């Protein structure tokens, strides 16, 4: 799905950065288990949508808009993990794969509610901080 | 997404049926907003997938497999609405739309957990009863499928001795106090049922028939 695939690329780029890794199409591919030509295809579309630009040095620089989108996806992704662990009680070993799906289907309104019903929305069960809370309106 | 499409298609046939409406292509198309041709192409696919049959009267008859999937999708859907209203507190005006998306991504594991965590899972906030609960668990899963590379505790639901030819391991299981209800820590390294401190390395036949639920 065009949009969902894009959100996964933006979230992946975000994570790499977060790990201190350089967003390189080959690493994105390797992390996504996808073929180079496929990631190229997708990153091309993404550029045409003004979400990313392959910097002259061939690294992937998220435009301001792409970054805002990548952040909201991660935000949802991480509120989702909190819902799963904190409330639903899902096996911790499944929280991330599930969250990888829900991040595409969760709405802003649900996010705000979760922010209001979860005891803490600072970090995810996995240690990384939950981004964009202020931009969400919570 | 083809998988998600079929699920939305099946859940809709399910809704009309429940509403007492005849599952007609024009009706479904209208409901899904999509056009009649698109629906025929998508119904054709399902028919080849053995999930639906365009009946005599031209209504859509879900095959058992179709209905089984339709029910599961509706279950996830209504379970999602309970999570959304009871726990999350999402505006009731936005619960249905949200649920139409979540039904495609909520795992069976999340469902069993919601069933445990929700106060009442008999009905959806909108009046209709939540289907497929029995087939969700709250029988069991064939040990061979439930067996993962990492151990975990599971409650025996059925051993199925009546179907066994090879009975050499019957006592082995009895000494290991592994019987109905017995929480045996299983794993896949073949499947080894561990309980009462003992371990029972099952054989293909036993592994397929013994069902451990959750």
Swiss-Prot record, chain A:
Compartment list: Cytoplasm
One GO CC term on file: cytoplasm
Keyword terms, alphabetized: Cytoplasm, DNA-binding, Iron, Repressor, Transcription, Transcription regulation
Top-rank taxon: Bacteria
A biological process term (GO) from this entry: negative regulation of DNA-templated transcription
Residue ranges of every copy of the HTH dtxR-type domain listed in the record: 2-63
Major location (coarse): cytoplasm
A molecular-function term among this protein's GO annotations: protein dimerization activity
Presence of keyword Cytoplasm: yes
Subunit structure: Homodimer.
Family note: Belongs to the DtxR/MntR family.
Role played: Iron-binding repressor of the dipheteria toxin gene expression. May serve as a global regulator of gene expression. Represses ripA under iron excess.
UniProt-recorded name of the protein: Diphtheria toxin repressor
Species in which this protein is naturally found: Corynebacterium diphtheriae (strain PW8)
Residues of the full protein shown: 3 to 140 of 226
């Amino acid at each position: 799905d065009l949009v969902d695939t894009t959100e996964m690329y933006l979230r992946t780029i975000y994570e790499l950065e977060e790990e201190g890794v350089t967003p390189l199409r080959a690493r994105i591919a390797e992390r996504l288990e996808q073929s180079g030509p496929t990631v190229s295809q997708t990153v091309a579309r993404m550029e045409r949508d003004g979400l990313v630009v392959v910097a002259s040095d061939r690294s992937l620089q998220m435009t301001p808009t792409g970054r805002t989108l990548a952040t909201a996806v991660m935000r949802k992704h991480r509120l989702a993990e909190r819902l799963l662990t904190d409330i639903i009680g899902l096996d911790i070993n499944k929280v991330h794969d599930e969250a990888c799906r829900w991040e595409h289907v969760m709405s802003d309104e649900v996010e705000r509610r979760l922010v209001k019903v979860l005891k803490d929305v600072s970090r995810s069960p996995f240690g990384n901080p939950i981004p964009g809370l202020d931009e969400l309106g919570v």
